[PDB]
Symmetry: D3
Subunit: 157 residues, 6 copies
């Protein structure tokens, strides 16, 4: 009974994230996407909206579910009986930042972290940059799930 | 039925490698350590010796086996019914190098790659540096499995 | 007929920037320095001040002009019938950041980005650090053009 | 008589910091730990609390003294008749940031900077991450000096 | 009349290279692709074979020419009345290596270097890795120009 | 009583190295430049030549001496009753490499390593690249001390 948690703010989920979800879901029996609620940033979408967007985009993944999360990620992981985190990485800078978190998380709770390399086609997409470009009129429709994109257009208009 | 391959030259296997093996074996139903034979470098230990050293060091891991490998790693992986590779990373430089390989391997064969961060205590150990230091008389006994260390002393004397 | 846009906040312009301008102006028929303004973030110098400081220190570059703008850089570029951005880089971290921006800008508008390595002498110079150092009385006279240094000291007092 | 300044917010001091202090005190005739006060960012501990926590953790270092500092670091260093800064580095991006600061500090005041590599065991610890983890109930006792940990428990209640 | 040299071994040219060539030819009045000959390392293709493969792949670039080159690159550039090199970059370590070469080339001869970021789709391709993969039966047809791929099959038999 | 060892192959010594020597000599009571020789790899200059070139360019540093050695650097250090190594760093890549070496050297012998940032002017300078450039006739006169430049040209002819 293997399993992994995929955390993020996902504000909104991108095709880069979806690619990671698909790859995690192909290698672990159970995947939980953890939408991390931060009260020190509302962001663009509500936690409810983010969850909904991810659920819509992951319907073809039978072994994946989506839940909101607060507090220590390692507590989220262990309270669900798991002890692995899966995250995507774009750059060596990402790796150095996530290395520190991964080692801390292993130290405090025995939770391991597995990283995957970004899909080449989505190397430059981040939720933040997608929102920024879209805000000023750039076409990001090829970078986001179809559902998300329409919802993003809504938030701007 | 999940599974992953852990490749390397392992000449010899270190405690850094063993840590990765243990972590892979804890998260996948089946782990295969692939000792990659290169004819353009005999190295210090024979493929047979490397395999033996890994088997000795991994006896407490029931779901791990060790095999030699040649040619395309993705062929090794797919011919055994798997499509995941697990490798440890120490630095952002490691990540950039392995990112390219991971993306190539996904492109040519659909095989994914999962990375784990090195254990902090073994951040500086590599097979090559361990051999170099030992060759000049430095004590690397805390960096290698007990079995390996004695075998290394043998190869030097 | 060839041309490029050199963007930045230039608050204020430094000798590192001027080196980039000179090198761009030597290689393309026209160069536009784009002073990009955040209408929600004032910065130290006004737009007219930033432009004046750049003009005064680029008087010997006949094919360079200075204009301000806001919003998407690729719109500024394309509205002038150009298709190239030129930016200096100091570090691998700069490169990772700017590579993602460049790939996004090419994706959304087909605009290309050319990078140039910092002059060794100015590799540690940034507008932000120069302002910070000067705020606490450090001597940054050799890092800024004459058109800038005393105006900066004036702002701070 | 050789000497160096070890600057930081140290809010609170960690075992990573202490390792740097010990190694600096072993190599320089005198070390001054400079606890840097920032008026706009009151941390978790007051400057006096931070100084006392460092003094307790460095009781066996007779050539190391602890003082509060404000303003331009190279002024602090020169006002005490010294000309060197010592800082620990964990990652390549630590180095890129500190290299530019070191080159700037050498340019503006002739003060040099010596770096040491983190101890492997503490490569992932930072004051900020330790505080964050502790705030949400994580056990960071193995990452901080005994005394600090007791005080940290106190501030969380 | 603006111009730049695009140097490499191009053994063989890849779609990553071609993307750089196209973008350079779009921005400079002339581009010379310099196929660098190294007497001690005969690659897979002869210099003449490499030149013909590039000519076939760049047939639609009328301002781009292909020549063989030997010796100091900045001599090659200056002998053709040019003063700029253009190269593609994939990763931060590509940048660190090329930054030092670019600074050296500017110091010794006044020749500048412009970099472009890789196309996302080809970020992982290199001539060396494509050859290695192909040698062991991997399909690299989507990574190389049509013609190159046919010739590559030929050299493997 | 304080002291440090500055190691390298110094084949030949460059202005980047001399900058590091000067800074080390300003901060510790004694500095030993350790010319480390590979008895299986001749290099361009003999040991006596390397030492002579360093002595001639460090005559104004009364507390610096030059000695050759081989094998483990930590043995060279400890045999002189010292416990510190000082090395310059140019890039994050240098840092990742040297951090692993420093941690290994501390592990096996308790010897510490202090790093210093390259002078901006010499950030792109290395013995290897200087030799390569000079081999093909590039002007490296401003990158090497007078004690080195013409001797290098002599070797090449
Ligand atoms: N294109 C991509 N491919 C793979 N992984 C990615 C990609 N883009 C982002 N990620 C990773 O997915 C994780 C979730 O990203 P998310 O946008 O949810 O949060 P974030 O990166 O922390 O951004 P923010 O700081 O705005 O919350 C992050 O670790 C991020 O590095
Ligand atoms: N301490 C460590 N922790 C985690 N992973 C490590 C550690 N040391 C090495 N590795 C990784 O394990 C993998 C196997 O290493 P191995 O020594 O077998 O081959 P290698 O790194 O390619 O060395 P060589 O080039 O000598 O073959 C490599 O990808 C390496 O980066
Ligand atoms: N010393 C330097 N040499 C070469 N290029 C530089 C140097 N310093 C900055 N640059 C380049 O100049 C560009 C514009 O710099 P500018 O300070 O205007 O903006 P910025 O770096 O985005 O800073 P801020 O965040 O303060 O607005 C930067 O993106 C960087 O690419
Ligand atoms: N584990 C560690 N090992 C070695 N050096 C470290 C470690 N953690 C931090 N440092 C160094 O100590 C210095 C001071 O750390 P401190 O927490 O005081 O400040 P900081 O990192 O700037 O944090 P903040 O931005 O939260 O004030 C940092 O610049 C860093 O170089
Ligand atoms: N996919 C890519 N995208 C952009 N630029 C690339 C790509 N692949 C290679 N390059 C650039 O093209 C240049 C020439 O590549 P080439 O294969 O000719 O030489 P190389 O990388 O030095 O290989 P080798 O060392 O095998 O000769 C490289 O310096 C690199 O900057
Ligand atoms: N420009 C520079 N500024 C500061 N330090 C430098 C510079 N160039 C080299 N160094 C440092 O000097 C040390 C000794 O350099 P040296 O050329 O003797 O050996 P190396 O870098 O190991 O080269 P090689 O592999 O050619 O023997 C290097 O390890 C590096 O730390
Ligand atoms: Mg992101
Ligand atoms: Mg290794
Ligand atoms: Mg800047
Ligand atoms: Mg910190
Ligand atoms: Mg290449
Ligand atoms: Mg070097």
């Amino acid at each position: 009974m293997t399993g992994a948690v995929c955390p993020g703010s996902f504000d909104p989920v991108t095709l880069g994230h979806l690619d990671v979800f698909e790859r995690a879901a192909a290698q672990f029996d159970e995947v939980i996407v953890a939408v991390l609620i931060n009260p020190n940033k509302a962001g663009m979408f509500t936690v409810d909206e983010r969850i909904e967007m991810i659920r819509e985009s992951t319907a073809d993944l039978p072994n994946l579910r989506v839940e909101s999360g607060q507090g220590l990620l390692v507590d989220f992981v262990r309270e669900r009986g798991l002890n692995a985190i899966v995250k995507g990485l774009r750059t060596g800078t990402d790796f150095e930042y996530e290395l520190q978190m991964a080692q801390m998380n292993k130290h405090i709770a025995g939770v391991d972290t597995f990283f995957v390399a970004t899909a080449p086609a989505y190397s430059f997409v981040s939720s933040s940059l997608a929102k920024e470009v879209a805000t000023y009129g750039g076409d990001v429709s090829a970078l986001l799930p179809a559902s998300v994109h329409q919802r993003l257009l809504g938030k701007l208009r």
